[PDB]
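Section 4.2 – Deliverable D4.2 (structural model, holo form)

The reporting period included a commitment to supply a predicted holo structure for the target in complex with magnesium ion. Inputs used:
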Amino acid sequence: WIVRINAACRQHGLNYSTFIHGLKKAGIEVDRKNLADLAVREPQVFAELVERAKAAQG
Amino acid sequence: MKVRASVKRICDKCKVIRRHGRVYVICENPKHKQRQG
Amino acid sequence: MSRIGRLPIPVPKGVSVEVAPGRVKVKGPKGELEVPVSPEMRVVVEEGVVRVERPSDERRHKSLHGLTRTLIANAVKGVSEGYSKELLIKGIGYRARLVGRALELTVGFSHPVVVEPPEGITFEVPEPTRVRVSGIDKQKVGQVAANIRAIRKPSAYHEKGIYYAGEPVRLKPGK
Amino acid sequence: MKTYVPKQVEPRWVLIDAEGKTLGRLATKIATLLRGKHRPDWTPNVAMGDFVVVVNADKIRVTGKKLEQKIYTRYSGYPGGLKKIPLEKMLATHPERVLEHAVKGMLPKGPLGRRLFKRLKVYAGPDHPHQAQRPEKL
Amino acid sequence: MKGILGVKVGMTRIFRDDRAVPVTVILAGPCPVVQRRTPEKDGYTAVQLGFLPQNPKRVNRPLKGHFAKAGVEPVRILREIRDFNPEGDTVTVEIFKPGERVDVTGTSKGRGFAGVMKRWNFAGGPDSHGAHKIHRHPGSIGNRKTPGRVYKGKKMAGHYGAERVTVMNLEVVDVIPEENLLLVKGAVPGPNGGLVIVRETKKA
RNA sequence: AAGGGAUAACCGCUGAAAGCAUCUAAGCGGGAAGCCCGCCCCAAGAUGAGGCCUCCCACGGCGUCAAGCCGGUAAGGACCC
RNA sequence: UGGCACCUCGAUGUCGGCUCGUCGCAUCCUGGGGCUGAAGAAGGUCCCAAGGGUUGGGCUGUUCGCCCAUUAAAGCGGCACGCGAGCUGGGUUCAGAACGUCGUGAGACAGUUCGGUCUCUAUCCGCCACGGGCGCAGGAGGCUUGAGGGGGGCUCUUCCU
Ligand SMILES: [Mg+2]
Ligand SMILES: [Mg+2]
Ligand SMILES: [Mg+2]
Ligand SMILES: [Mg+2]
Ligand SMILES: [Mg+2]
Ligand SMILES: [Mg+2]
Ligand SMILES: [Mg+2]
Ligand SMILES: [Mg+2]
Ligand SMILES: [Mg+2]
Ligand SMILES: [Mg+2]
Ligand SMILES: [Mg+2]
Ligand SMILES: [Mg+2]
Ligand SMILES: [Mg+2]
Ligand SMILES: [Mg+2]
Ligand SMILES: [Mg+2]
Ligand SMILES: [Mg+2]
Ligand SMILES: [Mg+2]
Ligand SMILES: [Mg+2]
Ligand SMILES: [Mg+2]
Ligand SMILES: [Mg+2]
Ligand SMILES: [Mg+2]
Ligand SMILES: [Mg+2]
Ligand SMILES: [Mg+2]
Ligand SMILES: [Mg+2]
Ligand SMILES: [Mg+2]
Ligand SMILES: [Mg+2]
Ligand SMILES: [Mg+2]
Ligand SMILES: [Mg+2]
Ligand SMILES: [Mg+2]
Ligand SMILES: [Mg+2]
Ligand SMILES: [Mg+2]
Ligand SMILES: [Mg+2]
Ligand SMILES: [Mg+2]
Ligand SMILES: [Mg+2]
Ligand SMILES: [Zn+2]
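Output (structure tokens):
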């Protein structure tokens, strides 16, 4: 699951360690590494999760 | 002399040259030149 | 303290120095030469003199400043025939006669040594007791003169060697 | 059983330029491209690491005193047969074995990565017989 | 690099002005060429000869059917003679000259499953002095626990001979033009009837 | 072996750091029965299974279709002496 | 040579020799070079270099060691002090017997001598050679390049200069 999430998030401009830091701090712990099937199946909402995670760096 | 572990400057006109990694010491008279090895 | 390159070039019979964006080509009245330059250090090609400029102070900018200037300074007097570079020979019956350019010479062997010169090296032989190696570049003359040294090794208890100027500091006799 | 099916389709073609890019640092993105890290549909048993051709296998830059000193090793089972070959000899002739050994040292060692070594072509050209359409990525 | 197809027919002595020479008479007759290689086609650029005549009914025609040069197909192995270049019809013996050094590459005699003492010239155990069964055995073949396994090429019994063997630096004594024969200086590899190729020796 | 290249010890050329000097920090050389070339055979089971010449080839029936459902047969191969 | 006693007492055969090798260099020679109290030759020492060689004998069971004739040299070591599912049994580590010594004696001695059973069939790995099946994306007859691997990688004497 770490390879699928890190594989899917990388082309958006952020890796796994940048991605989880928005989820643990922003109170958006939703993914929880079992939800890789939106990073695989339907990425138009996982990209919005990237949009919610990239603004939570500070 | 020749290859030694310690290198000292007998007959003070020695020149100490570090070439190709290791240390040589040379003079005019070639019986006092030294290689550290 | 004076780093070589803090004093200028200027050269009468003002040979041409061009850009050549990684190197230096020098064309003179006799020949052209070649000096490789490190690309980080900037030598400039202004009027009369050839300036040299280094960025900073470490173990490469402080030595390549002076390497880069001085290898040009050899090529300044190099292309105007500023090198004589004699090789005087000793010996009881040694001589060096020239046929064309391949300088054969008797150095005590069982056959006269045929010296094959490279391109651009002139073996001027005015005397049987002394020759001289001329050319354009200082490396091309000193290397071939070292090849002339490679036949006979001097200072072996007596004469019959070469010294590049004449310098017997040979050693004590053995009786 | 949850639906985590990889649904393997269409192995693609990527050529990598090696003009001044160093080995090792080049061979890690060749390693991840030969493995399949760029694809989100990942499953580690099926080989989805795409077809990668590398161009300009000559003049690969190496750093420091490693040319003439980094000596490879090719063993024969005969006694005394330890043929030591330097890196400047490996770059004088046969430039492809440097990159093939660099990718071979980074791929997995089983029958999967052994199959992945087939999916990596090396050419010192620039020319290659793979002529359908070749998009270049860096 | 001159070369020819040949076949051993026997050996004898010839007499020079003072010394006898142990010559081998060898039948390197008229050799038809069938195919030339090309740097733009195969690169190594050799030339394919074949030498001894075949009646056209034992052939099977992937072999019968080569073009204009040498329509009568030969018998033996169509050997390529490694950058040699004739004019196009055949290669006679007069390419070679007496006084030149020529290589002979043939096929030596297989001794069968030859022994280790006859093969690798060992010594073995003595006949007397209590020797149980060591009279032709090789003996020890390794060491105990380290290294363990026997090294590759321990020079034991097997198929000695019947391989392609090159004997070098042979000087040409005489040339027979009417039957197209060569007279090398002895020690040709191969039996009476073994085909060889005879190149130029280097030895520059 | 004769010959070629890169070399160890060693001998150098030019040259700053260190206005001098220096085989070295940039480079260019010479330099061994040592290393790789070169000689000979093994060798495409080098699945990375190479390359060239020549001979033959659509149905003669039908699927999960050009045999990956089958019977003879072209080039050839095999059995027997 | 030792110290330890960690696998081995339902046992891993011990010294030496013959055959067969392989590896390290801290090189005995051959190949280069520096110094020398190196006039030349012959030398001494040190640095690189293991590619190839390192004899035929007498003595003792000997490794070692001492002598004869040579060579340029008769190198030091490891591989269970290499090698007994290869061999030898001369010594030691069996029963017989004797000598010197100790012990009242039976016997003993890392003191000496003679003699004394050395175990036909290769299952797997390895190795030397030769094969069958299949593959080499149509089927065969040939020719052949070489990714790679081993062999050989010696050396002395005489003469001209
Ligand atoms: Mg060997
Ligand atoms: Mg036979
Ligand atoms: Mg015998
Ligand atoms: Mg018997
Ligand atoms: Mg017996
Ligand atoms: Mg082992
Ligand atoms: Mg100087
Ligand atoms: Mg040097
Ligand atoms: Mg050099
Ligand atoms: Mg050289
Ligand atoms: Mg011990
Ligand atoms: Mg204890
Ligand atoms: Mg047991
Ligand atoms: Mg025991
Ligand atoms: Mg025992
Ligand atoms: Mg040494
Ligand atoms: Mg010593
Ligand atoms: Mg010597
Ligand atoms: Mg002397
Ligand atoms: Mg060796
Ligand atoms: Mg040896
Ligand atoms: Mg034994
Ligand atoms: Mg036994
Ligand atoms: Mg045993
Ligand atoms: Mg005994
Ligand atoms: Mg007995
Ligand atoms: Mg008794
Ligand atoms: Mg029996
Ligand atoms: Mg067997
Ligand atoms: Mg087979
Ligand atoms: Mg072949
Ligand atoms: Mg090869
Ligand atoms: Mg192999
Ligand atoms: Mg080889
Ligand atoms: Zn001094």
